[PDB]
Design goal:
It is classed as transferase. 35% of the residues lie in helices and 15% in strands. It is an alpha+beta fold. The chain has 2 domains: 133 residues, Phosphorylase Kinase, domain 1 (2-Layer Sandwich); 188 residues, Transferase(Phosphotransferase) domain 1 (Transferase(Phosphotransferase), domain 1), CATH 1.10.510.10. Strands 3-4-5-7-6 form a 5-stranded antiparallel β-sheet, with no helix packed on it. A 3-stranded antiparallel β-sheet has the order 8-9-10. The chain has a two-stranded antiparallel ribbon with strand order 1-2. Helix 1 runs parallel beside helix 11. 34% of the residues are buried. The structure holds octyl beta-D-glucopyranoside (BOG). The site of octyl beta-D-glucopyranoside has 16 residues, from helix 3.
Length: 325
């Protein structure tokens, strides 16, 4: 067990292994930047706020730990460390999570740079999706990059949200994330938000202006009577020609955008398919685009007591094995 020290930070007493030095609040659970003297990395240390206050808090804590422990990929945020000052389950109150300190996020670029950034996003998404996980909130502030332009997917704007989410469809597919990637890509290439909706309905309005109103094939798959009736009352607008929207873009980029920003989620390109697109020819390497181990999400269906979620969480803290540097 490492020696901890205590220090008042964000109006509470943080208690962290001495390897983590010079904690500096970075926002708000609450996060401090620190220097990990064991690894020589700048890291973010997150002290969970009220992790076991309620059954929901407790399940949420356990989810977040489970997810972070699972994610072991260059383009996805992972867990460098997880700790508690508690020496037993009985004393177990606080959970700290340690990750790479990400120095900037994506919040116009050259086509070479966009290729590289979007490649990294897709590589990470191929991984995430292979675990049967859907991000559901990809956006520029959830994409961290360092000074070598190495990108990691992390974790109110609706500008990047797939239309079916905006419509509370449920039954989302993984290509909700691909929609988001198309939106980010478009913006990197143009320097302008693709669908800067002012409110919820406006977001859908802007989306349909670009991609057209649903065709006959998509209409067949819409169970909602209210949705169908509204849609068929709309003035049928065709898909815009993306080649004339993204003026002067690499035609491969335009072709990729067309394959991502398809109204029907079943017809959007997958992350693995997109990595094989010619746009990424200079990065694509089937040998090093790994998939994830299977992720046991069964806990999501469970309604357990605080002390049970806590115990499970304590189990995961105890079993944690740091990554090799
Ligand atoms: C007027 C606005 C209409 C927007 C149409 C969104 C269509 C999204 O695509 C759909 O999404 C679902 C969710 O995974 C699926 O179950 C469907 O098979 C699919 O067609």
């Amino acid at each position: 067990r490492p020696t901890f020290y205590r220090q008042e930070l964000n109006k509470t007493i943080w208690e962290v292994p001495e390897r983590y030095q010079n904690l500096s609040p970075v926002g708000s659970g609450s996060v401090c930047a620190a220097f990990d003297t064991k690894t020589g990395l700048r890291v973010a240390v997150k002290k969970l706020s009220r992790p076991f206050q309620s059954i929901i808090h407790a399940k949420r804590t356990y989810r977040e730990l489970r997810l972070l422990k699972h994610m072991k990929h260059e383009n996805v945020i992972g867990l460098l460390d997880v700790f508690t000052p508690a020496r037993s389950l009985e004393e177990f109150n606080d959970v700290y999570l340690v990750t790479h300190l990400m120095g900037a996020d994506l919040n116009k670029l050259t086509d070479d740079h966009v290729q590289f950034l979007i490649y990294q996003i897709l590589r990470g998404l191929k991984y995430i999706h292979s675990a049967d996980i859907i991000h559901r909130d990809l956006k520029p502030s959830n994409l961290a990059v360092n000074e070598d332009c190495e990108l990691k997917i992390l974790d109110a704007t609706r500008w990047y949200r797939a239309p079916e989410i905006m419509l509370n469809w449920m039954h989302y597919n993984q290509t909700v994330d691909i929609w988001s990637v198309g939106c980010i890509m478009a913006e990197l290439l143009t320097g302008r938000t693709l669908f800067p909706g002012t409110d919820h309905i406006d977001q859908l309005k802007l989306i349909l202006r670009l991609v057209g109103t649903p065709g006959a094939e998509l209409l067949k798959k819409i169970s909602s009577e209210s949705a169908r009736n509204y849609i068929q009352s709309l003035t049928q607008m065709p898909k815009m020609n993306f080649a004339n929207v993204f003026i002067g873009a690499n035609p491969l980029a335009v072709d990729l955008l067309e394959k991502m920003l398809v109204l029907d989620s079943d017809k959007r390109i997958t992350a693995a398919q997109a990595l094989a697109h010619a746009y990424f020819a200079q990065y694509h390497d089937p040998d090093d685009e790994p998939v994830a181990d299977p992720y046991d999400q069964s806990f999501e269906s469970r309604d357990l007591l605080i002390d049970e979620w806590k115990s499970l969480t304590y189990d995961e803290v105890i079993s944690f094995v740091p990554p090799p540097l």
